[PDB]
Design a protein around this motif. Structure first.
Motif, short mmCIF file in Angstrom:
data_model
loop_
_atom_site.label_atom_id
_atom_site.label_comp_id
_atom_site.label_asym_id
_atom_site.label_seq_id
_atom_site.Cartn_x
_atom_site.Cartn_y
_atom_site.Cartn_z
N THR A 39 29.09 -22.70 29.79
CA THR A 39 29.96 -23.50 30.69
C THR A 39 30.41 -24.78 29.97
OG1 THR A 39 28.96 -22.57 32.66
CG2 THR A 39 30.07 -24.68 32.94
N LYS A 40 29.45 -25.62 29.57
CA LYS A 40 29.70 -26.96 28.97
C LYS A 40 30.34 -26.79 27.59
CE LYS A 40 26.30 -29.91 31.35
NZ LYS A 40 26.04 -28.98 32.48
N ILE A 41 31.57 -27.27 27.43
CA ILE A 41 32.37 -27.20 26.17
C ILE A 41 32.16 -28.53 25.42
CG2 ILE A 41 34.58 -26.53 25.16
CD1 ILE A 41 35.55 -25.74 27.96
N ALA A 42 32.02 -28.45 24.10
CA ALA A 42 31.88 -29.61 23.17
C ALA A 42 33.16 -30.45 23.20
CB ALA A 42 31.57 -29.12 21.78
N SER A 43 34.33 -29.80 23.22
CA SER A 43 35.68 -30.43 23.21
C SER A 43 36.00 -31.15 24.54
CB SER A 43 36.73 -29.41 22.87
OG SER A 43 36.43 -28.78 21.63
N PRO A 92 15.40 -28.94 20.22
CA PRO A 92 16.67 -29.42 20.79
C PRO A 92 17.75 -29.78 19.76
CG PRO A 92 15.04 -31.20 20.81
CD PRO A 92 14.36 -29.98 20.23
N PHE A 93 17.35 -30.18 18.54
CA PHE A 93 18.26 -30.64 17.45
C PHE A 93 18.51 -29.50 16.45
CE2 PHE A 93 16.68 -34.72 19.14
CZ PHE A 93 17.86 -35.41 19.28
N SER A 94 18.87 -28.32 16.97
CA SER A 94 19.52 -27.20 16.24
C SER A 94 20.95 -27.01 16.78
CB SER A 94 18.71 -25.93 16.36
OG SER A 94 19.34 -24.86 15.67
N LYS A 95 21.12 -27.07 18.11
CA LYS A 95 22.44 -27.09 18.80
C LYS A 95 22.98 -28.53 18.83
CE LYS A 95 22.19 -25.11 22.90
NZ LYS A 95 23.52 -24.46 22.96
N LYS A 96 23.31 -29.09 17.66
CA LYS A 96 23.95 -30.43 17.51
C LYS A 96 24.94 -30.40 16.34
CE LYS A 96 21.68 -32.16 21.00
NZ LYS A 96 22.42 -32.18 22.28
N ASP A 97 26.23 -30.19 16.64
CA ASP A 97 27.35 -30.15 15.67
C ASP A 97 27.87 -31.58 15.47
OD1 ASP A 97 29.88 -29.46 14.26
OD2 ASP A 97 29.46 -27.41 14.97
N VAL A 130 27.53 -33.81 19.21
CA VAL A 130 27.49 -33.26 20.60
C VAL A 130 26.91 -31.84 20.51
CG1 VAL A 130 29.76 -32.13 20.88
CG2 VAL A 130 28.77 -33.37 22.80
N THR A 131 26.49 -31.26 21.65
CA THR A 131 25.89 -29.90 21.75
C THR A 131 26.93 -28.84 21.36
OG1 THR A 131 24.49 -28.49 23.08
CG2 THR A 131 26.40 -29.43 24.20
N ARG A 132 26.46 -27.68 20.87
CA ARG A 132 27.31 -26.49 20.56
C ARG A 132 27.89 -25.94 21.87
NH1 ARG A 132 24.49 -26.60 15.77
NH2 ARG A 132 25.23 -25.29 14.06
#
Lengths: 213, 25, 62, 136, 98
Positions: A35-39, A4-9, A29-31
């Motif tokens: 659908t779900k945007i980080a911004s 799970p902690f590879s897609k974490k910017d 937050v997630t990459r």
RNA sequence: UAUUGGAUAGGAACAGCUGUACUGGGCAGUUACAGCAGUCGUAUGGUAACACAUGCGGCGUUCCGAAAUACCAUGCCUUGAUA
RNA sequence: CCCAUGAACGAGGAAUUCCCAGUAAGUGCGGGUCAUAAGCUUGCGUUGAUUAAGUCCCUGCCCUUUGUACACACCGCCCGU
RNA sequence: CGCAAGACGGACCAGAGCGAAAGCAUUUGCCAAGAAUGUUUUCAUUAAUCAAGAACGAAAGUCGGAGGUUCGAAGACGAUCAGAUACCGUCGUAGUUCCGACCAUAAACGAUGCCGACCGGCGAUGCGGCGGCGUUAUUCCCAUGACCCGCCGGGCAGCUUCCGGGAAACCAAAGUCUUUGGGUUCCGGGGGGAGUAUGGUUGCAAAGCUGAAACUUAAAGGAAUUGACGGAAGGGCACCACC
């Protein structure tokens, strides 16, 4: 089985530019996948951060709530949200054989930032006092509380949101109450103990860049 | 016997009498 | 994981159910500043060494 | 796991929500916001006895696995937020708060500003027990 | 007989006071009856304070205290040994022990 | 360079009653044991059926994986027999 | 005293006794009982330990407060169907 | 991070305040009331206590409407147990909350009627008034606010006395009592049977108020003393106790 902690910017969260310390720290937050945007993901977050973390060499018993209203690409622009006094100092001031006087007001700035300011204040034992109990009568409490409401509405109605936070960074409101209410009953620990922004106007990034520039 | 409970037993006795005496009316 | 030592610097009486655990102020041999309080089974004179199999647990004093 | 941070003059801060009640211990670690979390290890994941989920032994194992997990992602300082059961229940932090806080720092973590954030009810609802309370 | 002059409570001209609950039990006791404490205890008392203020970031950080007011019913305050049975003459003493 | 893998090794909670030992004594549970209730097989009597008797023997129980178990309360009552 | 006979018993369930230094425990020898006479009792030496220098947890004891409807004094007194 | 609805008023909160008692605590406003104080104001005995009668009366409970989140009689299960329709735990219906009627009781207690008179100190406390070194704020000094030292009145109380009383415990009243009389209302007459039966009355009900007798019984009881006892506390001790 997945990681799970590879897609974490990570994003360096920045306090508004009316402070001495700018970088608060990092938030993840997630990459931005599908659908779900980080911004839109880390845009509703509150940071309860002390004054020792924001000013040069200040006091550690005053925390500021700071919301992120903008992500400028690896950069969050945190806006002023609320203010709170710590459990420690608040619970240290409340002691027996003295009168506690609380006040609240619902007042907006020159721009449409509708705040709710809470004041507290405690009666003082004089420098030669022998009598223990040291209380204030109800008409003395009612006059103190009336002037607590007066000074809070006065010094927030005059000016905009930067100028009221810069009135809270040094407690210029609470010292006006402690000196103004001397010739009713002398108070000793007078603080605007909590500020709570109720309503907020339509967002303009041009004037958030004033608070971050 | 606790006086509350003695008073509660004499209370139910009197409900039983008022019930069984409303028969002969 | 380590297995550490500690020297008895002061005795603090005798605890337990039947009076069998000696409560002891021990001093570590990594840092000679770092002290903890320890329950010991068996006869203890002041100024001998103990083997601590966990160096984290600190006992309930009185 | 990926951190671009230089180890020169930085401590990257997480937040450790330690909820030591009288039957368990939470050693929950987040980012500064609170929203995005890294690791939570409880006392009951370290013992196979419901009795000892409270235990001060289990609470130090919880912090040892939290500090092992936090180093891999690369958070090296903690803002501690202690907590009791709160509400109309007890405000005393339970018997594995000082084990979960001792064991954090000694596992190579840096302690920041601490606060006891037990939910104090300004005028609560009716407490479970009844008028005559809990008759043991 | 009458054991105590005040009936083991601190109401003299009221008739009614607000009752509060205990802490260990929830025995609904009058406020002026209850055995009350106000403990100002360090979060980490003395055992960890060395191993916390030496592994802290900040220069000479003084650790925040834990303020809690604890209400006890008479039944429990004895069992927890906060108060004791006292000699008939020793009962009258009002001063607290230091 | 040992994960595994059946099985017998081996532990466990489950009861059909007296007796002894827990008590100053009594009734309760509780444990260990022996006898016999139940029980299985057996020779006979009897019968169209056959379900029992007789006398002679055998007799825990289910669990199938370890077991370091806090095991609390270790319950209540106490001659008419003479002041 | 001799010769023949060569039984249970593989360290003993629940429970339970005595004991802290020449002590426990082992092995003998005296005295009493005694016409006959030590698996007993009371003394003596010999070989000679383990573990402890503690606590009130069990069982009980002594002080001080405290509570009591108990005084043939908790093996007390006493309630109701 | 929000959002929603309904309860509650923490710490400050005290042997402090107010109210006839029950009782009463978040801010601001409105409404009508009251004590004490001060007064060279006014009327001039208008007063005190009160059968019948009337107003208010916690909690629970009853009726109709709105509401329900916490808690939680009854109920269901899980533990414990010799059984446990209990204590412990998980759920829960009426109730708990608001409005409009009801009922009229509590260890409704200070187990202590009200009005008045007199009779020792001491330090505090609340409210009003008065007087007095100084400190402090309003600075621009006085009057005032916050402290300091006394005085007077009314009030919740303390401590302390061989006043005096009391069976004592104790009480500045529970005193001023065989040296018995200020005025007045309620009310007790050994323990049970019994707040029972029966009449009357009140209530929708539950129940309230008034309320015996036959019969039974030598004690039931109050306060203090000493001992024994405790699954009471503090301090010791014993291999006829443990480790």
């Amino acid at each position: 089985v997945v990681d799970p902690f590879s897609k974490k910017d990570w994003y360096d969260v920045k306090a508004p530019a009316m402070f001495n310390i700018r970088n608060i720290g990092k938030t993840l937050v997630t990459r931005t996948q599908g659908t779900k945007i980080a911004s839109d993901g880390l845009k509703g977050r509150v940071f309860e951060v002390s004054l020792a973390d924001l000013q040069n060499d200040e006091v550690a018993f005053r925390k500021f709530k700071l919301i992120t209203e903008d992500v400028q690409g690896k950069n969050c622009l945190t806006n002023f949200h609320g203010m709170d006094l710590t459990r420690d100092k608040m619970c240290s001031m409340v002691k027996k054989w003295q009168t506690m006087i609380e006040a609240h007001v619902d007042v907006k700035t020159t721009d449409g930032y509708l705040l709710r300011l809470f004041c507290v204040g405690f009666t003082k034992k004089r420098n030669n006092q022998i009598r223990k109990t040291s209380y204030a009568q109800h008409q003395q409490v009612r006059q103190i509380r009336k002037k607590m409401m007066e000074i809070m509405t006065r010094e927030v109605q005059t000016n905009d949101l930067k100028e009221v936070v810069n009135k809270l960074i040094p407690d210029s409101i609470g010292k006006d109450i402690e000196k103004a209410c001397q010739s009713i009953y002398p108070l000793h620990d007078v603080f605007v103990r909590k500020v709570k922004m109720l309503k907020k106007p339509k967002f303009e990034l041009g004037k958030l860049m004033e608070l971050h520039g | 016997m606790r006086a509350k409970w003695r008073k509660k037993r004499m209370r139910r006795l009197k409900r039983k009498r008022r019930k069984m005496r409303q028969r002969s009316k | 994981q380590p297995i550490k030592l500690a020297r008895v610097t002061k005795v603090l009486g005798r605890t337990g159910s039947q009076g069998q655990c000696t409560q002891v102020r021990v001093e570590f041999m990594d840092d000679t500043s770092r002290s903890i309080i320890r329950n010991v089974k068996g006869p203890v004179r002041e100024g001998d060494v103990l083997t601590l199999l966990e160096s984290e647990r600190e006992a309930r004093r009185l | 796991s990926l951190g671009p941070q230089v180890a020169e003059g930085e401590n990257v801060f997480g937040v450790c929500h330690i909820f030591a009640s009288f039957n368990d211990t939470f050693v929950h670690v987040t980012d500064l916001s609170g929203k995005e979390t890294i690791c939570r290890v409880t006392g009951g994941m370290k013992v196979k006895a419901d009795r000892d989920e409270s235990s001060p032994y289990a609470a130090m194992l919880a912090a040892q696995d939290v500090a092992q997990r936090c180093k891999e992602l690369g958070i090296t300082a903690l803002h501690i937020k202690l907590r009791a059961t709160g509400g109309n229940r007890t405000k005393t932090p339970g018997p594995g708060a000082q084990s979960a806080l001792r064991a954090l720092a000694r596992s190579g973590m840096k302690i920041g500003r601490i606060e006891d954030v037990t939910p104090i009810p300004s005028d609560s609802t009716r407490r479970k027990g009844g008028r005559r309370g809990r008759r043991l | 007989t009458k054991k105590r002059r005040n009936n083991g409570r601190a109401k003299k001209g009221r008739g009614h006071v607000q009752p509060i609950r205990c802490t260990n039990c929830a025995c609904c006791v009058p406020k002026d009856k209850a055995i009350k404490k106000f403990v100002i205890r360090n979060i980490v008392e003395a055992a960890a304070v060395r191993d916390i203020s030496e592994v802290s970031v900040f220069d000479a950080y003084v650790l925040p205290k834990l303020y809690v007011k604890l209400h006890y019913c008479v039944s429990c305050a004895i069992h927890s040994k906060v108060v004791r049975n006292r000699s008939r003459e020793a009962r009258k003493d009002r001063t607290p022990p230091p």
